[PDB]
mmCIF file of all heavy atoms in Angstrom:
data_model
loop_
_atom_site.group_PDB
_atom_site.id
_atom_site.type_symbol
_atom_site.label_atom_id
_atom_site.label_comp_id
_atom_site.label_asym_id
_atom_site.label_seq_id
_atom_site.Cartn_x
_atom_site.Cartn_y
_atom_site.Cartn_z
ATOM 1 N N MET A 93 0.800 -1.221 0.000
ATOM 2 C CA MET A 93 0.000 0.000 0.000
ATOM 3 C C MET A 93 0.829 1.265 0.000
ATOM 4 O O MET A 93 0.361 2.294 -0.487
ATOM 5 C CB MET A 93 -0.980 -0.029 1.176
ATOM 6 C CG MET A 93 -1.832 -1.308 1.211
ATOM 7 S SD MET A 93 -2.714 -1.750 -0.305
ATOM 8 C CE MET A 93 -3.819 -0.402 -0.423
ATOM 9 N N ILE A 94 2.071 1.188 0.490
ATOM 10 C CA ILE A 94 3.020 2.301 0.364
ATOM 11 C C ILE A 94 3.300 2.512 -1.121
ATOM 12 O O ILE A 94 3.338 3.654 -1.575
ATOM 13 C CB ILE A 94 4.325 2.000 1.149
ATOM 14 C CG1 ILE A 94 4.067 2.113 2.649
ATOM 15 C CG2 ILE A 94 5.450 2.946 0.718
ATOM 16 C CD1 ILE A 94 5.200 1.610 3.472
ATOM 17 N N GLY A 95 3.486 1.412 -1.856
ATOM 18 C CA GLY A 95 3.744 1.479 -3.287
ATOM 19 C C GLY A 95 2.567 2.024 -4.068
ATOM 20 O O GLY A 95 2.764 2.731 -5.062
ATOM 21 N N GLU A 96 1.343 1.656 -3.604
ATOM 22 C CA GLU A 96 0.126 2.150 -4.277
ATOM 23 C C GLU A 96 -0.044 3.645 -4.048
ATOM 24 O O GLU A 96 -0.488 4.337 -4.950
ATOM 25 C CB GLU A 96 -1.078 1.338 -3.736
ATOM 26 C CG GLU A 96 -2.433 1.858 -4.206
ATOM 27 C CD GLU A 96 -3.594 0.974 -3.775
ATOM 28 O OE1 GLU A 96 -3.424 -0.266 -3.675
ATOM 29 O OE2 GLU A 96 -4.689 1.534 -3.546
ATOM 30 N N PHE A 97 0.343 4.140 -2.864
ATOM 31 C CA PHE A 97 0.241 5.569 -2.598
ATOM 32 C C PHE A 97 1.292 6.336 -3.405
ATOM 33 O O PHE A 97 0.958 7.300 -4.092
ATOM 34 C CB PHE A 97 0.436 5.813 -1.085
ATOM 35 C CG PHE A 97 0.380 7.262 -0.721
ATOM 36 C CD1 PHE A 97 -0.857 7.902 -0.533
ATOM 37 C CD2 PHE A 97 1.549 7.996 -0.600
ATOM 38 C CE1 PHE A 97 -0.899 9.247 -0.226
ATOM 39 C CE2 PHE A 97 1.479 9.339 -0.300
ATOM 40 C CZ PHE A 97 0.264 9.954 -0.111
ATOM 41 N N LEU A 98 2.548 5.887 -3.322
ATOM 42 C CA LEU A 98 3.655 6.565 -4.002
ATOM 43 C C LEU A 98 3.595 6.461 -5.510
ATOM 44 O O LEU A 98 4.021 7.383 -6.199
ATOM 45 C CB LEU A 98 4.992 6.003 -3.517
ATOM 46 C CG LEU A 98 5.330 6.234 -2.056
ATOM 47 C CD1 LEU A 98 6.611 5.470 -1.706
ATOM 48 C CD2 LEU A 98 5.510 7.700 -1.753
ATOM 49 N N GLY A 99 2.999 5.378 -6.012
ATOM 50 C CA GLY A 99 2.869 5.161 -7.449
ATOM 51 C C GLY A 99 1.713 5.914 -8.096
ATOM 52 O O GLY A 99 1.533 5.826 -9.313
ATOM 53 N N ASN A 100 0.927 6.667 -7.306
ATOM 54 C CA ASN A 100 -0.179 7.439 -7.838
ATOM 55 C C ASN A 100 0.339 8.744 -8.424
ATOM 56 O O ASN A 100 0.683 9.666 -7.685
ATOM 57 C CB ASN A 100 -1.206 7.697 -6.728
ATOM 58 C CG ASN A 100 -2.477 8.336 -7.249
ATOM 59 O OD1 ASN A 100 -2.626 8.682 -8.426
ATOM 60 N ND2 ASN A 100 -3.440 8.510 -6.351
ATOM 61 N N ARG A 101 0.321 8.841 -9.754
ATOM 62 C CA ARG A 101 0.762 10.055 -10.441
ATOM 63 C C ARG A 101 -0.329 11.104 -10.598
ATOM 64 O O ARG A 101 -0.054 12.201 -11.079
ATOM 65 C CB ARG A 101 1.343 9.680 -11.818
ATOM 66 C CG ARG A 101 0.285 9.540 -12.913
ATOM 67 C CD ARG A 101 0.901 9.087 -14.218
ATOM 68 N NE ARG A 101 1.449 7.725 -14.056
ATOM 69 C CZ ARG A 101 2.072 7.079 -15.051
ATOM 70 N NH1 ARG A 101 2.231 7.648 -16.253
ATOM 71 N NH2 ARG A 101 2.547 5.842 -14.815
ATOM 72 N N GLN A 102 -1.552 10.778 -10.195
ATOM 73 C CA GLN A 102 -2.684 11.676 -10.426
ATOM 74 C C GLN A 102 -2.914 12.746 -9.359
ATOM 75 O O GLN A 102 -3.743 13.644 -9.549
ATOM 76 C CB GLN A 102 -3.960 10.824 -10.560
ATOM 77 C CG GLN A 102 -3.908 9.855 -11.731
ATOM 78 C CD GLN A 102 -3.851 10.601 -13.067
ATOM 79 O OE1 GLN A 102 -4.516 11.631 -13.309
ATOM 80 N NE2 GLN A 102 -3.035 10.092 -13.972
ATOM 81 N N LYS A 103 -2.175 12.683 -8.258
ATOM 82 C CA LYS A 103 -2.322 13.675 -7.204
ATOM 83 C C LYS A 103 -0.978 14.308 -6.905
ATOM 84 O O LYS A 103 0.023 13.619 -6.706
ATOM 85 C CB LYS A 103 -2.904 13.028 -5.937
ATOM 86 C CG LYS A 103 -4.390 12.728 -6.104
ATOM 87 C CD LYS A 103 -4.992 12.151 -4.841
ATOM 88 C CE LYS A 103 -6.514 12.229 -4.929
ATOM 89 N NZ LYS A 103 -7.164 10.914 -4.567
ATOM 90 N N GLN A 104 -0.967 15.636 -6.871
ATOM 91 C CA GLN A 104 0.235 16.418 -6.634
ATOM 92 C C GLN A 104 0.927 16.033 -5.351
ATOM 93 O O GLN A 104 2.154 15.946 -5.337
ATOM 94 C CB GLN A 104 -0.134 17.933 -6.637
ATOM 95 C CG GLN A 104 1.062 18.870 -6.504
ATOM 96 C CD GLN A 104 1.886 18.871 -7.728
ATOM 97 O OE1 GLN A 104 1.456 19.344 -8.773
ATOM 98 N NE2 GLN A 104 3.122 18.352 -7.618
ATOM 99 N N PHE A 105 0.135 15.803 -4.284
ATOM 100 C CA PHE A 105 0.715 15.481 -2.984
ATOM 101 C C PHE A 105 1.489 14.209 -3.034
ATOM 102 O O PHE A 105 2.630 14.190 -2.599
ATOM 103 C CB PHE A 105 -0.390 15.444 -1.930
ATOM 104 C CG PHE A 105 0.158 15.361 -0.537
ATOM 105 C CD1 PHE A 105 0.749 16.468 0.059
ATOM 106 C CD2 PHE A 105 0.048 14.183 0.187
ATOM 107 C CE1 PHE A 105 1.236 16.382 1.356
ATOM 108 C CE2 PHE A 105 0.543 14.120 1.478
ATOM 109 C CZ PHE A 105 1.131 15.215 2.058
ATOM 110 N N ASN A 106 0.897 13.174 -3.627
ATOM 111 C CA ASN A 106 1.567 11.879 -3.746
ATOM 112 C C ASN A 106 2.873 11.981 -4.535
ATOM 113 O O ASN A 106 3.888 11.421 -4.113
ATOM 114 C CB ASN A 106 0.629 10.876 -4.415
ATOM 115 C CG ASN A 106 -0.632 10.610 -3.613
ATOM 116 O OD1 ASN A 106 -1.310 11.517 -3.136
ATOM 117 N ND2 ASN A 106 -0.998 9.341 -3.505
ATOM 118 N N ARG A 107 2.870 12.750 -5.640
ATOM 119 C CA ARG A 107 4.096 12.935 -6.424
ATOM 120 C C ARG A 107 5.159 13.673 -5.631
ATOM 121 O O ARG A 107 6.332 13.304 -5.687
ATOM 122 C CB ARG A 107 3.805 13.701 -7.725
ATOM 123 C CG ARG A 107 2.867 12.956 -8.678
ATOM 124 C CD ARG A 107 2.920 13.548 -10.079
ATOM 125 N NE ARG A 107 2.830 15.008 -10.047
ATOM 126 C CZ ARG A 107 1.676 15.704 -10.076
ATOM 127 N NH1 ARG A 107 0.498 15.049 -10.113
ATOM 128 N NH2 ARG A 107 1.712 17.033 -10.059
ATOM 129 N N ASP A 108 4.745 14.674 -4.852
ATOM 130 C CA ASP A 108 5.696 15.395 -4.010
ATOM 131 C C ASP A 108 6.281 14.508 -2.906
ATOM 132 O O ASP A 108 7.465 14.619 -2.586
ATOM 133 C CB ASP A 108 5.022 16.631 -3.400
ATOM 134 C CG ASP A 108 4.630 17.726 -4.382
ATOM 135 O OD1 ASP A 108 5.027 17.647 -5.558
ATOM 136 O OD2 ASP A 108 3.932 18.662 -3.969
ATOM 137 N N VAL A 109 5.465 13.601 -2.369
ATOM 138 C CA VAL A 109 5.951 12.673 -1.351
ATOM 139 C C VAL A 109 6.984 11.732 -1.961
ATOM 140 O O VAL A 109 8.016 11.511 -1.338
ATOM 141 C CB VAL A 109 4.770 11.884 -0.725
ATOM 142 C CG1 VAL A 109 5.302 10.805 0.232
ATOM 143 C CG2 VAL A 109 3.822 12.839 0.046
ATOM 144 N N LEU A 110 6.717 11.201 -3.170
ATOM 145 C CA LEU A 110 7.659 10.287 -3.829
ATOM 146 C C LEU A 110 8.970 10.974 -4.145
ATOM 147 O O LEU A 110 10.022 10.357 -4.007
ATOM 148 C CB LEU A 110 7.008 9.685 -5.087
ATOM 149 C CG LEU A 110 7.896 8.740 -5.942
ATOM 150 C CD1 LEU A 110 8.452 7.584 -5.140
ATOM 151 C CD2 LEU A 110 7.119 8.173 -7.120
ATOM 152 N N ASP A 111 8.908 12.266 -4.478
ATOM 153 C CA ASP A 111 10.127 13.047 -4.685
ATOM 154 C C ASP A 111 10.951 13.116 -3.409
ATOM 155 O O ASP A 111 12.163 12.904 -3.457
ATOM 156 C CB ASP A 111 9.781 14.497 -5.113
ATOM 157 C CG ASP A 111 9.345 14.661 -6.539
ATOM 158 O OD1 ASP A 111 9.496 13.745 -7.291
ATOM 159 O OD2 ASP A 111 8.898 15.768 -6.904
ATOM 160 N N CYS A 112 10.285 13.346 -2.270
ATOM 161 C CA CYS A 112 10.983 13.377 -0.984
ATOM 162 C C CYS A 112 11.526 11.997 -0.643
ATOM 163 O O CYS A 112 12.618 11.904 -0.067
ATOM 164 C CB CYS A 112 10.044 13.884 0.152
ATOM 165 S SG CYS A 112 9.525 15.628 -0.034
ATOM 166 N N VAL A 113 10.821 10.936 -1.059
ATOM 167 C CA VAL A 113 11.286 9.589 -0.779
ATOM 168 C C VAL A 113 12.600 9.250 -1.483
ATOM 169 O O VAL A 113 13.541 8.766 -0.850
ATOM 170 C CB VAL A 113 10.184 8.554 -1.132
ATOM 171 C CG1 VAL A 113 10.784 7.133 -1.154
ATOM 172 C CG2 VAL A 113 9.018 8.638 -0.116
ATOM 173 N N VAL A 114 12.647 9.487 -2.783
ATOM 174 C CA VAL A 114 13.852 9.138 -3.562
ATOM 175 C C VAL A 114 15.004 10.046 -3.278
ATOM 176 O O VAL A 114 16.155 9.609 -3.364
ATOM 177 C CB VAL A 114 13.547 9.066 -5.086
ATOM 178 C CG1 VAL A 114 12.473 7.997 -5.391
ATOM 179 C CG2 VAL A 114 13.116 10.457 -5.634
ATOM 180 N N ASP A 115 14.702 11.294 -2.874
ATOM 181 C CA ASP A 115 15.756 12.243 -2.526
ATOM 182 C C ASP A 115 16.483 11.884 -1.231
ATOM 183 O O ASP A 115 17.552 12.418 -0.969
ATOM 184 C CB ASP A 115 15.184 13.671 -2.446
ATOM 185 C CG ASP A 115 14.883 14.278 -3.813
ATOM 186 O OD1 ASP A 115 15.282 13.672 -4.843
ATOM 187 O OD2 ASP A 115 14.220 15.326 -3.858
ATOM 188 N N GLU A 116 15.971 10.893 -0.486
ATOM 189 C CA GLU A 116 16.647 10.362 0.698
ATOM 190 C C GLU A 116 17.580 9.211 0.361
ATOM 191 O O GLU A 116 18.268 8.709 1.251
ATOM 192 C CB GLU A 116 15.577 9.817 1.673
ATOM 193 C CG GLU A 116 15.800 10.281 3.114
ATOM 194 C CD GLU A 116 14.996 11.525 3.469
ATOM 195 O OE1 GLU A 116 13.752 11.504 3.309
ATOM 196 O OE2 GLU A 116 15.613 12.522 3.908
ATOM 197 N N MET A 117 17.573 8.776 -0.898
ATOM 198 C CA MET A 117 18.346 7.615 -1.308
ATOM 199 C C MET A 117 19.550 7.987 -2.150
ATOM 200 O O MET A 117 19.463 8.854 -3.029
ATOM 201 C CB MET A 117 17.433 6.675 -2.117
ATOM 202 C CG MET A 117 16.264 6.161 -1.285
ATOM 203 S SD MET A 117 15.151 5.155 -2.301
ATOM 204 C CE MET A 117 13.906 4.771 -1.074
ATOM 205 N N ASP A 118 20.679 7.312 -1.859
ATOM 206 C CA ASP A 118 21.946 7.519 -2.551
ATOM 207 C C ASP A 118 22.225 6.307 -3.417
ATOM 208 O O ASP A 118 22.441 5.195 -2.911
ATOM 209 C CB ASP A 118 23.084 7.708 -1.518
ATOM 210 C CG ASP A 118 24.478 7.836 -2.108
ATOM 211 O OD1 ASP A 118 24.582 8.136 -3.338
ATOM 212 O OD2 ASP A 118 25.468 7.483 -1.394
ATOM 213 N N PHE A 119 22.234 6.553 -4.732
ATOM 214 C CA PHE A 119 22.537 5.513 -5.723
ATOM 215 C C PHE A 119 23.852 5.759 -6.473
ATOM 216 O O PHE A 119 24.118 5.126 -7.491
ATOM 217 C CB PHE A 119 21.412 5.459 -6.762
ATOM 218 C CG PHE A 119 20.041 5.182 -6.212
ATOM 219 C CD1 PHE A 119 18.920 5.758 -6.808
ATOM 220 C CD2 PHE A 119 19.864 4.310 -5.151
ATOM 221 C CE1 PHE A 119 17.656 5.488 -6.322
ATOM 222 C CE2 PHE A 119 18.592 4.057 -4.677
ATOM 223 C CZ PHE A 119 17.498 4.660 -5.262
ATOM 224 N N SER A 120 24.700 6.605 -5.936
ATOM 225 C CA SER A 120 25.927 6.987 -6.600
ATOM 226 C C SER A 120 26.933 5.866 -6.675
ATOM 227 O O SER A 120 27.118 5.133 -5.721
ATOM 228 C CB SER A 120 26.536 8.243 -5.959
ATOM 229 O OG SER A 120 27.014 7.995 -4.644
#
């Protein structure tokens, strides 16, 4: 259900949350 919330591209809030999520991750 975390994936279902973050994977929702139709709501601005959800997209902003996913941006904050990936910005916490280091893939360098």
Side-chain angles (χ1 to χ4, degrees):
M93 307 308 295
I94 287 170
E96 172 175 327
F97 179 82
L98 295 173
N100 188 356
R101 85 184 65 181
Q102 299 295 320
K103 286 183 165 131
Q104 184 71 68
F105 190 74
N106 297 47
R107 297 196 313 271
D108 293 350
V109 174
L110 177 56
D111 284 348
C112 294
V113 167
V114 300
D115 286 350
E116 227 95 56
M117 298 176 182
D118 176 18
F119 302 146
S120 68

